[model samples]
Target: TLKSFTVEKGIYQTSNFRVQPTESIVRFPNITNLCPFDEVFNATRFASVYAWNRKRISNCVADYSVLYNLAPFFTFKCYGVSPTKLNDLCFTNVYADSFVIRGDEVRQIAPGQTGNIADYNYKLPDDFTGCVIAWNSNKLDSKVSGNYNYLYRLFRKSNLKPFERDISTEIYQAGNKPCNGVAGFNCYFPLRSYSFRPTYGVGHQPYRVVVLSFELLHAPATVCGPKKSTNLVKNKCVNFNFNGLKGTGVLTESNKKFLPFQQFGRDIADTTDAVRDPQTLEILDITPCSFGGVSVITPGTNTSNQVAVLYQGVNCTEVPVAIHADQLTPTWRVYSTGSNVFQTRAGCLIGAEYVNNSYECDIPIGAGICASYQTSQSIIAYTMSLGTEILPVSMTKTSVDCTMYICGDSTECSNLLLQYGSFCTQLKRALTGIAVEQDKNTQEVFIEDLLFNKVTLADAGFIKQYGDCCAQKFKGLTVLPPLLTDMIASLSSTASALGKLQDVVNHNAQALNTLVKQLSSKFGAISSVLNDIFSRLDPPEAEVQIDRLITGRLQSLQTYVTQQLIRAAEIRASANLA
Candidate 1:
């Protein structure tokens, strides 16, 4: 169809228009347009499984909303005839329609998990082709944990291109600034912009715009994923796209328009052999309706924008016609942004340069690149609900082996240390499928390396190694006794471990010298009885055996005494545990 506005005059009541160019500024009001997903999630990271009676994730609000019984939901938006920049926009707002996430909105990122509504499918004014939205959910930084890698399977099967993000600036200037008053809405700020860096030659560079339609009234969130964005806090996120080479606008820049290469559907099919790329910019146009609700026509130089019969009037800040909508204009446009109209989005694709983008953090910060694109025509994203699921979490260890000091000896006590590192270097060759091991020559294994193993032990040495690994990787690990590192080393090679034992005893004498501490704290007489034990801060094998035998006999005697001296603590039949 070669058209835009399907105005049902008097069929829908027109609301007044706001004056802000970047924000709510439509000559006509669109009361019928729905900001979907608002019912289940008003803002990202505010809802949870605590809702819906039990813990299943679903849009509970849509089930009760009376509007759901009415007409709602827009079909997948298609590209229209082109100048690309639509001249006459047409489209009706449908509430609670299924909107696919064009970006890899990872489930573990804290605030980053909030899916941008703009990355949606909206009917366009023109016919466009050769475009795809990328799905991105993988973290470039593997050092950070908590991000799931299983969804990557769905990623490879689809055409979702990866979105390499970067910071880009969008500028907007007010032409009628002198005539505008500062009563209700005043001059905005720098109009901060956040931009996703394009995949400059590395991958597909299809240009598309995200169209978001939300319910106008307060309703349940019907969109997929958790209502709260906190569930996905893996410190990494991905971007996915839906469909269409429709209207293109960056940030909340109002009035200003962008044209990606050439507009689709603008060609008259055999009229021009030139085949120049489409040069059209589509925009969300707000207009006044005469029916019971407002009407909206996606406007641009192209002819792809259109209207539907579906109406979603909830889940959004409904701009009242009395204050925002003027009697003369009778229309208004609404957008999500700070006070500034044009916002500057971040540039994540440029790699770690972004670490310096904000000058606040002085610590060592690393970044990476990941790209995946999507559109409604091909929704390639694996969406997960936003809440705690009984996810089988498998803990993994870090790749590198970083040494841990003897508990609190910060002086780098020993010049030499017996560092246990995983040698995955040579091990890979010996392994198959999921099997892996550290190669002695090439691979390295560290105490931090055995994290995933979680293997338990019965020996004191093995327990010591476990303690060292846990202390290095996890938050809560048992603290090793002072100079334990040196003591253990004595049992190893050139005594890198034992080298620090003397120093530890000298600094925290009583502590490292177990005999002194044992005598001072406990029954001092026991220490006197165990005079020779202190001589073995890890003694020879012969000495160890002797001490064990004596201690073993003493333990037997103590156990016998306790049995005869104390009353039975349990009342049981024939030792049956039921």
Candidate 2:
């Protein structure tokens, strides 16, 4: 391909053009003239090329309307392009399509289980992997010191040689700014007018606008152990050639622990020779994410001027590892969702029929799904889903052993207290996994007694109501009592004794009458005998014979009564038993 632009020597005029020139501006005219053109110099020498129509690539952002979806993990957004500042970049505008997350949205945590949509302070998963660079830098770029510092660092690195590398990386105005060992006035190479110095020299630096791309790299399998980013553990690259030094931009550190880096492509032949070193600011092994936030690199300090991603040697199991996406620009390839997204622990998606990135809480706060990073707790974090949203959850975490206490004692989790017994310790060890809930019907306290291995409340302690039904319960018994003696005795002996007593009185009367009649006859004989005796003897002497006769009659009557008494007792006992 030849070229589409050309230059010719011309005089500058105010009415001719509205331009801000930093170099010679010669106009090319398409005049109808018989003139010979120089064909030899018409080469594609410093020409920049673009693919898919750079103008067609739209600016991108995360959509807020639809935060999450079941089919596709998250929503997409395509915004309009402008010459505005983009995520910490030296360049003005870029075409960026970001997977969305509202930084202002928050998770307000109390104790126990966190709340649902109604629970969070903000109006805020899974089967979704990867994320786009997101941050706010939409204001128009003013050519101020921050702008100049941003401009020169990029231009000097792209246009000037490494031997003359005297560019600054400052963004804000540097009045009392610190130095980076560059020999010059401290505050950001002190501003100057183009009149004093100009021209960054042309045609020397190759790949002036080298298109840099970056992708994620995972830890070794043996190292990471289990539960890591599922996408792949290998290096991924986003290599492309920039024509017109195709546009460039920046992406600030959206997440802390998940540091990203660059990698070489598969075909070595397609790799750029004079491009920037992918490992120039390489992030080696990284420590857990928490330390980075705790020991924050204060942004403006002299020691903090060098913005470098940290790397400490540690394996992050099931953690979401964030790789660099070059700049927050649409110049790179767009990422996909669905099964391609990661998930080490599938169980986290419970009850969430609709996948939400907001609930993918397996990772630390701010770190989204499909990332593997380190944490001090030593747990593998894949993806966390609470409700439809992803809750930042650590996939792997070590648990503590001391988890129980004496039932009512709030003092400590005493393992020995439950294992061994003491009078003071009322309940055995408090049962974990024992859910204490209220019974809906009875509205009584429902608690599981772990030590006893029981959850039913009635089994726990004495209940009054249960015994109230004891009488009714006994009615169901099939067995009878051993003693019906009182009943039978009353029925038989009560009537028998009364009937016998009346009969006994009449029998006694009849016997006495018979005896009396007999006695009178006997007495008459005794009297006649006594009369004979009396005539022969005195009356006192005759009493002896009379008393003897009377004694004999009494003995006979006693014998009769004894026989009757013995028969009566037998009649009552035997008859009642029968």
Q: Pick the candidate with the highest TM-score.
A: 1
Off by over 4 Å in 1: 1-244, 248-484, 487-578
Could you give the C-alpha RMSD of every candidate to the true structure, in order shown?
38.4, 50.2
Measured by TM-score, how close is model 1 to the native structure?
0.12
Error of 2 at 56 (Å): 99
Residue 30 of model 2 has an lDDT of: 18
TM-score, candidate 2, is 0.12
lDDT, residue 565, candidate 2: 43
How high is each candidate's TM-score? 0.12, 0.12
lDDT of 1: 0.24
Alpha-carbon shift of residue 365 in model 1 (angstroms): 17
